[PDB]
Amino acid sequence: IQTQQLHAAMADTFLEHMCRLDIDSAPITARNTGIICTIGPASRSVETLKEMIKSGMNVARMNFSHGTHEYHAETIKNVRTATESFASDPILYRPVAVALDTKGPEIRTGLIKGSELKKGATLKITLDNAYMAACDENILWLDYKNICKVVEVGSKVYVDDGLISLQVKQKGPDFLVTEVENGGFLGSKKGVNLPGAAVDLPAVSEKDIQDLKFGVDEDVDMVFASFIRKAADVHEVRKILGEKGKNIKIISKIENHEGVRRFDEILEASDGIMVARGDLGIEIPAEKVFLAQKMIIGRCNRAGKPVICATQMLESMIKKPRPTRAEGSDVANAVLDGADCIMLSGETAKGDYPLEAVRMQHLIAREAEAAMFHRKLFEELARSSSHSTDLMEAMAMGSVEASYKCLAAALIVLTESGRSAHQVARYRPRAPIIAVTRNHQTARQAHLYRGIFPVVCKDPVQEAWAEDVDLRVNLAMNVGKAAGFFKKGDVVIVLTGWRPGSGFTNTMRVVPVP
Numbered sequence: 207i208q209t210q211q212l213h214a215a216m217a218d219t220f221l222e223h224m225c226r227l228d229i230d231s232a233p234i235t236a237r238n239t240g241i242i243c244t245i246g247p248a249s250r251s252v253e254t255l256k257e258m259i260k261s262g263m264n265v266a267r268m269n270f271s272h273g274t275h276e277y278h279a280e281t282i283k284n285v286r287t288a289t290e291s292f293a294s295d296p297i298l299y300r301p302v303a304v305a306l307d308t309k310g311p312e313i314r315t316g317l318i319k320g321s322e323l324k325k326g327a328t329l330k331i332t333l334d335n336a337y338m339a340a341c342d343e344n345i346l347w348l349d350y351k352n353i354c355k356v357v358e359v360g361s362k363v364y365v366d367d368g369l370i371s372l373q374v375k376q377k378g379p380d381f382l383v384t385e386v387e388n389g390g391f392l393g394s395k396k397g398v399n400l401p402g403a404a405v406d407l408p409a410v411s412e413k414d415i416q417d418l419k420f421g422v423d424e425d426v427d428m429v430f431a432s433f434i435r436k437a438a439d440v441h442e443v444r445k446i447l448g449e450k451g452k453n454i455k456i457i458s459k460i461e462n463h464e465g466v467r468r469f470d471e472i473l474e475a476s477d478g479i480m481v482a483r484g485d486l487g488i489e490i491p492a493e494k495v496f497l498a499q500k501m502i503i504g505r506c507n508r509a510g511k512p513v514i515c516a517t518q519m520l521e522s523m524i525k526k527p528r529p530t531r532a533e534g535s536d537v538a539n540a541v542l543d544g545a546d547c548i549m550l551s552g553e554t555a556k557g558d559y560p561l562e563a564v565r566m567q568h569l570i571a572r573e574a575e576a577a578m579f580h581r582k583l584f585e586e587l588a589r590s591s592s593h594s595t596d597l598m599e600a601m602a603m604g605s606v607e608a609s610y611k612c613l614a615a616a617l618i619v620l621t622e623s624g625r626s627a628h629q630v631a632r633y634r635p636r637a638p639i640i641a642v643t644r645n646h647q648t649a650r651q652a653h654l655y656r657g658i659f660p661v662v663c664k665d666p667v668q669e670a671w672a673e674d675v676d677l678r679v680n681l682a683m684n685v686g687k688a689a690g691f692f693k694k695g696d697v698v699i700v701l702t703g704w705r706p707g708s709g710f711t712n713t714m715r716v717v718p719v720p
């Protein structure tokens with residue numbers, strides 16, 4: 207009994223690869239898939255924060271659909287304080303990224319009276335700012351001022367995670383009379399969803415404009431933009447960002463139909479993507495969700511752009527320690543699907559078991575990462591890029607191939623720009639990728655890329671390239687051994703440059719571990 211499910215990796219047919227999976231075949235020490243965690247009241251604390259890091263958190267999310275700049279910044283300080291707390295040990299310091307989550311076109315309910323359930327009976331919506339204080343079972347206030355121009359008589363309306371379905375029956379300039387199809391206990395400040403109606407709310411709102419620019423000041427590494435349908439919308443966020451936020455990544459989250467419908471354009475303009483299941487679910491018929499998930503992920507893999515899979519990956523775990531049999535198939539399959547990053551929203555913010563959440567995202571990810579059919583995968587991926595004759599593409603391809611043959615312990619890529627490493631992760635190797643940069647943004651952002659295990663060089667630049675290179679290499683070397691990625695006489699591929707100002711890692715080597 208082999209390890210890393212290698213007996214399955216040998217199969218000729220997919221069926222045989224599945225047939226060959228073994229519960230008793232041990233995964234490796236490293237984790238390739240990233241884990242994006244959404245911080246909230248349950249995980250804001252520096253002590254809570256650090257342990258979260260130590261558990262496995264890579265990226266820290268900041269949901270701006272809720273929150274004051276004051277609150278967000280505190281969240282930030284903290285994230286970096288727990289982050290830089292480990293910084294005195296170079297070989298065991300884990301860089302952590304920070305991400306902003308925008309609130310694009312987002313209808314949200316009003317407030318309920320300080321004294322709210324609904325039956326298969328009638329209710330009425332109001333936009334007049336007077337019932338906003340008192341939102342009784344009989345009356346509700348929407349955030350959207352242009353609601354009566356979008357929806358028609360018979361048109362359905364959803365709220366509180368599509369949990370409550372409202373059928374439309376009547377109109378008015380300042381109203382809408384609606385019946386309850388599927389109703390229950392209506393909360394306070396729940397968001398509505400208008401599937402099959404056109405939201406005319408701007409992609410980028412004053413608040414979003416405000417929120418974004420602030421990101422620029424907080425040195426956030428990437429922006430998760432909500433509700434993207436067009437590419438022109440992607441542009442707008444780039445504009446709002448400007449030169450200062452030149453180096454920030456723009457990950458478009460698909461939440462609508464138009465979004466799935468106009469994905470190529472979006473993909474191009476984007477720098478990453480996010481499958482925002484929580485919203486799309488409401489937006490498109492939920493039975494259709496998996497289809498849009500795989501299309502998306504597959505398309506992003508073929509393209510070389512990082513992709514995120516989120517919303518309700520381990521819900522149940524919010525109140526309960528152990529996930530469900532389906533929570534676990536969801537997360538495992540998502541890794542198989544080939545998502546470069548998984549993510550927790552409820553389980554790590556509101557959550558009662560925050561850490562226990564991260565831990566299982568990590569355990570499931572390791573097992574699902576080896577279940578992958580790396581041989582077919584790379585052939586299937588090589589074929590697609592067959593049109594490209596890039597040099598790094600070539601060099602990435604080689605390295606991955608050669609790591610399959612000699613069963614490498616890891617791939618060590620010395621980058622700055624982080625491109626070279628990006629380019630190799632793209633080739634879905636089966637071993638960890640140790641990227642070594644002196645650039646911080648680069649390290650922090652490298653999480654977005656599957657397989658990449660960033661390390662950062664605090665050491666000055668030395669005179670001889672040869673020695674600088676051997677300087678960085680060594681570190682990689684040292685850091686793998688400690689983390690335990692590889693032992694004393696293991697083999698490992700190294701990718702560097704021949705001479706400075708190389709532009710790309712054009713030198714490959716097969717160097718045993720000292």
Ligand SMILES: [K+]
Binds near residue numbers: 269270271308309
């Ligand atoms: K949001």
Ligand SMILES: [Mn+2]
Binds near residue numbers: 432482484485
């Ligand atoms: Mn959303």
